[PDB]
């Protein structure tokens, strides 16, 4: 009989890099502001065999997190340590899955 009013428009930090893992691509350098210059190349030997790696100057590097948030690392050397101590290779790693294939017996994929 009686009802109340309604409206509803719905309907109608201290980042580190593991030189053992790093391969020296330098996208961290591109992700770093030029004013800081924290990422730097360190040369070890022949360039074609891996050669140079990259390093962070902890004093110069002040909590930008652009490198890791960009998630551009192919090698996973760009790691982030946390105040509690956990280490991150990637911002979000895919979950590990128990992989086993599906083949219907009567369907064409058997």
């Amino acid at each position: 009989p009686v009802e109340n009013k309604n409206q509803a428009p719905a309907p109608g930090k201290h980042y580190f890099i593991i030189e053992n893992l790093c391969v020296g691509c330098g996208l961290c350098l591109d992700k770093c502001p030029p004013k800081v210059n924290a990422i730097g190349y360190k040369f070890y030997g022949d360039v074609q065999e891996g050669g140079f790696r990259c390093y962070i100057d902890q004093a110069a590097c002040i909590s930008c997190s652009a490198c890791f948030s960009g998630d551009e690392c192919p090698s996973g050397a760009l790691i982030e340590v946390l105040p509690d101590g956990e280490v991150l290779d990637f911002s979000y790693t895919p979950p590990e899955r128990l992989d086993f294939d599906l083949r219907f017996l009567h369907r064409f994929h058997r």
Partner: protein, 360 residues
């Protein structure tokens, strides 16, 4: 004419910094009839929380339930002071008023809730990064006082005195009384088991303007992990995260033609740190999911849903499951597709997860 479709818009505006303090704006309309023998059923509920004292840890919450059912107006207003004494024990001091039609009774209450988890293993918290099913038990001890200022109310108190003093099985049937109708089913569909109550005291002292009936009683809620009150007790009460008066309005109107819902409000605790540096929009409490599925299974529907999560600037979503359809460079939008299937899932009682992980 035969098609029944649900049109819903959702907006989650998170705020920057460690504290979430998010705003939720939800609109919903569905053509399916409601599962209520009394129709039309209209309700307005206003929940406002205010920080009474940060040093004492006292928060103040006022809930105003205004409802119209079968042309009858009911109003349960309740102002309460919640205080976290310990991580297990919590205290409450409050006053309220229930006015149904011409009848109205005011109540006051002192209440201690002691929530104890059964298992405090470090192994589980060490292994599982996202604990959902946490069993436990909540012991409520409530001393509630009501002025016996009405003759019918006095009759109720007198009859209850004799009922308690006459039947020893009253502690079992009081659950049937308390869980009026389908509620008694829902507790079994949500993993909630309720122990027989214990009436510590049942006495009456008189105030100069009228008598006051005082009843102290205890009961034991028991959660098998699915219960939000037990498993998410810490996420339940973000008093430390609350410094600004938060508030939510929620009104749903249910004619036989359709149901219209509007829920607009800001509150803290929307996003919590799930570990790994990614803030997670909080896991869906499962009790609402199953209890709403109880009525949502009753009819089929087409799904037209749209969620618009407004991230604060500088943050990006790293995980969404299902994926967001469109992005406005700050707002992540889930419209249709597997999100529609998930909306169907949760409407009908599904407890599937919707992992929104976002980070700096």
């Amino acid at each position: 004419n035969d098609v029944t479709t649900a049109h819903s818009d959702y907006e989650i505006v998170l705020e920057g910094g460690s504290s979430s303090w998010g705003k939720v704006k939800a609109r919903a309309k569905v053509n399916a009839p409601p599962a209520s023998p009394l129709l039309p059923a209209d309700c307005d509920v206003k929940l406002n929380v205010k920080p009474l004292d940060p040093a004492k840890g006292f928060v103040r919450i006022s809930a105003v339930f205004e409802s119209i059912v079968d042309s009858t107006k009911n109003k349960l207003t309740i102002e309460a002071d919640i205080a976290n004494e310990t991580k297990e024990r919590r205290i409450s001091v409050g006053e309220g008023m229930v006015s149904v039609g011409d009848f109205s009774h005011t109540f006051s209450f002192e209440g201690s809730v002691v929530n104890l988890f059964y298992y405090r293993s470090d192994a589980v918290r060490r292994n599982v990064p996202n604990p959902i099913y946490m069993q436990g038990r909540q012991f409520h001890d409530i001393l509630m006082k009501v002025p016996l200022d009405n003759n019918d109310l006095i009759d109720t108190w007198e009859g209850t005195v004799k009922a308690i003093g006459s039947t020893g099985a009253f502690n079992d049937w009081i659950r049937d009384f308390w869980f009026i109708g389908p509620a008694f089913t829902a507790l079994n569909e949500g993993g909630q088991r309720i122990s027989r109550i214990e009436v510590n005291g049942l006495n009456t002292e008189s105030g100069p303007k009228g008598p006051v009936g005082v009843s102290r009683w205890r009961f034991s809620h028991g959660g098998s992990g699915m219960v939000d009150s037990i498993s998410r007790w810490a996420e339940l009460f973000p008093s430390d995260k609350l410094n600004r008066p938060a508030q939510v309005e929620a009104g749903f109107r249910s004619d036989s033609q359709g149901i219209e819902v509007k829920v607009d409000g800001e509150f803290p605790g929307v996003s919590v740190d799930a570990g790994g540096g990614l803030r997670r929009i909080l896991n869906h409490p499962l009790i609402p999911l199953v209890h709403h599925g109880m009525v949502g299974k009753f009819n089929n529907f087409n799904v037209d849903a749209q969620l618009k999560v407004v991230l604060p600037k500088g943050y990006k979503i790293r995980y969404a499951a299902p994926q967001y359809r469109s992005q406005n460079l700050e707002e992540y939008r889930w419209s249709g597709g597997a999100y529609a299937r998930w909306v169907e899932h949760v409407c009908k009682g599904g407890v599937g997860q919707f992992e929104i992980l976002y980070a700096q």
